[PDB]
């Protein structure tokens, strides 16, 4: 009947999932460059920059 009696395992799973999710989401940042995708930034510029 009573739920949420296994909070520890669910907490571990949620922590791991959240860490993976934020690691994946960090891939869309700019970091000061003109874009965040290699394909567009390579098909638009002379290499030296």
């Amino acid at each position: 009947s009573t739920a949420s009696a296994l909070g520890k395992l669910q907490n571990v799973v949620n922590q791991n999932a959240q860490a993976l999710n934020t690691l994946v989401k960090q891939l869309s940042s700019n970091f000061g460059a003109i874009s965040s995708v290699l394909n567009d930034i390579l098909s638009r510029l002379d290499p030296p920059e």
Partner: protein, 50 residues
């Protein structure tokens, strides 16, 4: 036109061959900032301003 009344034109719905513009030696200075001049023949844009 005058400096304070520079002429502005909008270009859309066309295919542009920038190669003939680049290879021409008539232009004294040709500086491309955001992109490389030789890569213009591959990209496609919209709402070009001149």
């Amino acid at each position: 036109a005058s400096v304070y009344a520079w002429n502005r034109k909008r270009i859309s719905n066309c295919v542009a061959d920038y190669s003939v513009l680049y290879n021409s030696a008539s232009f004294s200075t040709f500086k491309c900032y955001g992109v490389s001049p030789t890569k213009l023949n591959d990209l496609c844009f919209t709402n070009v301003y001149a």
